[PDB]
């Protein structure tokens, strides 16, 4: 998979347009293959058009949390869902807590077209 199709698969859900059921993360972490080998401790889904998300790569350039400088912060807050493992999880069967939030996202961008390949953070 290209890094861009992997970002869409791990972090984009343009159809929700917010996580209204708290069963959402349990059934989207599985749906997007994030529980195939182990429990991914944390992951964020973005509920905006892909045009709104890809357009973040031309907005405020900020520093990636690992030191790199090709990360970008969104102009307006975006609808996101934080998936977090509960205290009761473990990998046969992964259990996740769902939190709907409206935050700005930060992504690392690459390529032509210049698009998000890593999800860095929320503010």
């Amino acid at each position: 998979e290209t890094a861009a199709a992997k970002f869409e698969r791990q972090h984009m859900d343009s159809s929700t347009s917010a996580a209204s059921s708290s069963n959402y993360c349990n059934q989207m972490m599985k749906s997007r293959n994030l529980t195939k080998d182990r429990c991914k401790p944390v992951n964020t889904f973005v509920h905006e058009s892909l045009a709104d998300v890809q357009a973040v790569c031309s907005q405020k350039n900020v520093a990636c949390k690992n030191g790199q400088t090709n990360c970008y912060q969104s102009y307006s807050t975006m609808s996101i869902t934080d998936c977090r493992e509960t205290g009761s999880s473990k990998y046969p069967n992964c259990a996740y807590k769902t939190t709907q939030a409206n935050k700005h996202i930060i992504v690392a961008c690459e390529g032509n077209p210049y698009v998000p390949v890593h999800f860095d953070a929320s503010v």
Partner: nanobody, 121 residues
């Protein structure tokens, strides 16, 4: 829309000197990293020099350190390449790029149209 604006290239004798200027206008913030890449006829595109918005993070390609000097207006979206002692192998189109990391080609999403530099022997 972010206009990339380059100038300073053209024809120059071997052992000669040139100064490339590049400015990104219409960007509401400050590209942390900007730099120069170059491509020749046939040769694949390669990195030349790169510098961060503080004045640090300075990096040159192993083929041009000592002959070439990057600089930026601190905090501003401008980048300059002073080239001295020029060889015929420096002949190439020089591209200004903004918003990536070091000389990592895939990480910049802003590229200028390119400034032709030709160095006769």
């Amino acid at each position: 829309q972010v206009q990339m604006v380059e100038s300073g290239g053209g024809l120059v004798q071997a052992g000669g000197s040139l100064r490339l200027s590049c400015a990104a206008s219409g960007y509401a913030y400050t590209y942390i990293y900007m730099g120069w890449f170059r491509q020749a006829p046939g040769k694949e595109r390669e990195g030349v020099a790169a510098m961060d918005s503080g004045g640090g993070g300075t990096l040159y390609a192993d083929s041009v350190k000592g002959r070439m000097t990057i600089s930026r207006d601190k905090g501003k979206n401008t980048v300059y390449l002073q080239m001295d002692s020029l060889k015929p192998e420096d002949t190439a189109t020089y591209y200004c790029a903004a918003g990536g990391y070091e000389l990592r080609d895939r990480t910049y999403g802003q590229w200028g149209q390119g400034t032709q530099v030709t160095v006769s022997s």
